[PDB]
């Protein structure tokens, strides 16, 4: 058979024909070769389950052997799966920087990554500098931002500011960035974004051994437990250095702290495959974490 597949990066759409024996690795390799990406360790191919979950393709398995939702064409999103600890030291290629910028900016503008208003205005000004270059008055006259989506809806809704007021606040900062190259505006954006509480955190709905609703966060530095209505402030923090072991079986997951005296933290996921995906992200993040320290 010849199966039709689309892979979308943040700024490219690729249509492929594959065969039943094509592996995720072979699809991934063709994607990164087409776009010129060398820093591949951060990225993966996301898809929708037969039951509607967003998960990552296994590159060491056949594409059809995984339970990708049966549609034509098959739809994959080439996205960052792991985040660096410091964008300045770790994102060396310009394409890598731009793919992280677009993906992060998308999550900020769609309210998936919480951002307070003052930070949102400042981030928008660096995105403006990245798109328009230097603020020039022969080129940029009043209303030049009216067609740009610049701020998260949550920021708009709070605040009684009109569009022109938001655009003037952003314009003030845009003027401040005069002379900044477009790749430096992109990296400046990411330096601010990487300090946000929700940046680079994979959230999973989980439950206490009592049944209370919580969130688990998996990120580059370890695991966090959050209250149900506060994904900004971790209730309990488990950096890798403070974890003795982690285990899962079926739906149950257990974190043992480096200190026997300290109690185990026990939580439940809704499905076995969620626990597998949590652990896949723990192992990948733990692995990159150790690699940075060689």
């Amino acid at each position: 058979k010849t199966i039709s597949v689309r892979v979308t990066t943040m700024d490219a759409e690729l249509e492929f024909a594959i065969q039943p024996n094509t592996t995720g690795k072979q699809l991934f390799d063709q994607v990164v070769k087409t776009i010129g990406l060398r820093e591949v360790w951060f990225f993966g191919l996301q898809y929708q389950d037969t039951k509607g979950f967003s998960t990552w393709l296994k590159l060491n398995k056949k594409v059809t052997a995984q339970d990708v939702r049966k549609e034509s064409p098959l739809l994959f999103k080439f996205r960052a799966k792991f985040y660096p600890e410091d964008v300045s030291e770790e994102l060396i290629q310009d394409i890598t920087q731009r793919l992280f910028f677009l993906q992060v900016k998308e999550g900020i503008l769609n309210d998936d990554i919480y951002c307070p208003p003052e930070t949102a205005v400042l981030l928008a000004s660096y995105a403006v500098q990245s798109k328009y270059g230097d603020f020039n008055k022969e080129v940029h006259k009043s209303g030049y931002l009216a067609g740009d989506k610049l701020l998260p809806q949550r920021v708009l809704e709070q605040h009684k500011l009109n569009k022109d007021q938001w655009e003037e606040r952003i314009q003030v900062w845009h003027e401040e960035h005069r002379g900044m190259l477009r790749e430096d505006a992109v990296l400046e954006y990411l330096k601010i974004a990487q300090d946000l509480e929700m940046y680079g955190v994979n959230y999973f709905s989980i439950k206490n051994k009592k049944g209370s609703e919580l969130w688990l966060g998996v990120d580059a530095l370890g695991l966090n437990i959050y209250e149900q209505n506060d994904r900004l402030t971790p209730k309990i923090g488990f950096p890798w250095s403070e974890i003795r072991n982690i285990s899962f079986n079926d739906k149950k997951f257990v974190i043992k702290p480096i200190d026997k005296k300290a109690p185990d933290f026990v939580f439940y996921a809704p499905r076995l495959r969620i626990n597998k995906r949590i652990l896949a992200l723990c192992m990948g993040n733990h692995e990159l974490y150790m690699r940075r320290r060689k």
Partner: peptide, 14 residues
Amino acid sequence: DSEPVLKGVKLHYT
């Protein structure tokens, strides 16, 4: 052998 074959491309500049 069974490498994927590129059939179409769209590039978004901005």
